[PDB]
């Protein structure tokens, strides 16, 4: 008989180079020598937050007592963006939990124990340097503008909801970073745009997608759900009506197969119903600490897209 | 929301406003409710105006015109004179 013990894996690959086609962090895993630097049995502490907004998802990691060779490989490439993937689970499988580029790295080795630090960004390089220069005339179909701008961003299309037969009412011009322009189109058309684990997600506010996840005491829930406001401020109201404005909170054992834009079903004894996801935070302490995930849910009032 | 405090014989008004934020966390033993209250936040951050005046207008008139727009009681004002 065994116990139920945690497991994880961390991989470091070649520098990421942006080209003239969508970037996939998967293909950069292999190093010039072939197999990548894998780190399994070392105490690790990490925190990974995810959201549906302009900003990329960022995660922090700490590793104790790394071998000198690995640290040397990171002393080099300090000018470059190494690709990194993280996996976690329970002794039988490990689900992808983050993938991005090493934004920052530093080492402090006071006496007894060295402590390496990381800051990782989910597509930070693309979202902050992809320039654009486009224009359109009166009568252009809005569905064409959306596709044109996304292709400029150079990322795979996770999911998109086209506008239909919508047409521009006035001439438009777009410059600067493509991400910023798209985030502005979100406000005026009730659409949510956010990149996550390399995938572009374009959806409509208020509406939600089946029960892709069910939460219950069998599903490793942790404590009862509690109602928490989804924003730190309140807006004036007429009392688009379809927009968000309500939510709840839940916690569960670590499970990387969840994304901010997904949908979950809450099977508890007090609260029951369907909710959207709005925010994720993954925490982990291998030898000591939690191994759980926190979800911020938001009520929905739109159509079932 | 209103809040009162004192010493066992009387309670003086100490704050009055609107509940800007509220959240609940109930880990195991004890629930802990949180609040953030604002003193007139809604009025101060949404009261729009559109006014103009010409050369020679008395400044004392401009002040009164703008305050009435803000839609709040006048606690105390010191007019500008002439």
């Amino acid at each position: 008989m065994r116990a139920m013990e945690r497991t994880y894996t961390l991989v470091i690959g070649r520098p990421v180079v942006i080209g003239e086609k969508p970037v996939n962090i998967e293909k950069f895993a292999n190093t010039s020598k072939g197999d990548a630097y894998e780190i399994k049995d070392l105490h690790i502490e990490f925190n990974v937050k995810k959201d549906n907004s302009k900003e990329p998802n960022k995660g922090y990691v700490t590793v104790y007592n790394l071998s000198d060779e690995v640290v040397n490989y990171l002393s080099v490439n300090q000018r470059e963006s190494l690709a990194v993937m993280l996996h976690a689970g329970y002794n039988g499988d490990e689900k992808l939990i983050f993938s991005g580029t090493v934004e920052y790295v530093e080492d402090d080795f006071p006496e007894e124990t060295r402590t390496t630090k990381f800051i990782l960004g989910d597509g930070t390089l693309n979202l902050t340097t992809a320039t654009t220069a486009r224009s359109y005339r009166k009568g252009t179909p809005v569905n064409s503008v959306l596709n044109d701008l996304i292709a400029d961003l150079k990322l795979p299309k996770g999911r998109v909801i086209d506008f239909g037969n919508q047409t521009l009412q006035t001439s438009m011009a777009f410059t600067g970073n493509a991400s910023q322009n798209l985030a502005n189109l979100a406000k005026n058309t009730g659409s949510t745009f956010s990149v996550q684990d390399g995938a572009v997600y374009w959806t409509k506010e208020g509406s939600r997608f089946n029960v892709m996840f069910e939460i219950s005491e069998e599903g490793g829930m942790v404590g009862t759900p509690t109602p928490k406001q989804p924003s730190s401020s309140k807006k004036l109201i007429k009392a688009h009506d379809i927009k968000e404005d309500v939510g709840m909170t839940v916690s569960t054992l670590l499970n990387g197969a969840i994304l901010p834009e997904s949908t979950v079903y809450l099977n508890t004894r007090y609260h029951k119903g369907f909710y959207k996801v709005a925010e994720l935070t993954h925490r982990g302490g291998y030898e000591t600490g939690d191994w759980i995930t926190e979800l911020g849910l938001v009520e929905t009032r739109g159509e079932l897209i | 929301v209103m809040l009162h405090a004192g010493y066992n014989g009387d309670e003086k008004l100490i704050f009055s406003g609107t509940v800007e934020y509220v959240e609940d966390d109930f880990p195991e033993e004890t629930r802990t409710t949180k609040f953030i209250l604002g003193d007139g936040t809604l009025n101060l951050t949404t009261a729009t105006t559109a006014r103009s005046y010409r050369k020679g207008t008395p400044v004392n008139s401009v002040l009164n015109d703008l305050i009435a727009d803000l839609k709040l009681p006048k606690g105390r004002v010191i007019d500008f004179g002439n």
């Binding site: 924003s231 730190s232 401020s233 004036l236 | 800007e20 953030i36 604002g38 936040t41 951050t45």
Partner: peptide, 26 residues
């Protein structure tokens, strides 16, 4: 024990976010 400190830092960050983003019609 860092758990206790992280909570206070989080609360302070929350207060600052509220201070920046408040009221408004948009």
């Amino acid at each position: 024990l860092r758990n206790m400190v992280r909570a206070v830092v989080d609360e302070n960050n929350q207060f600052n976010f509220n201070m920046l983003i408040q009221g408004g019609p948009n």
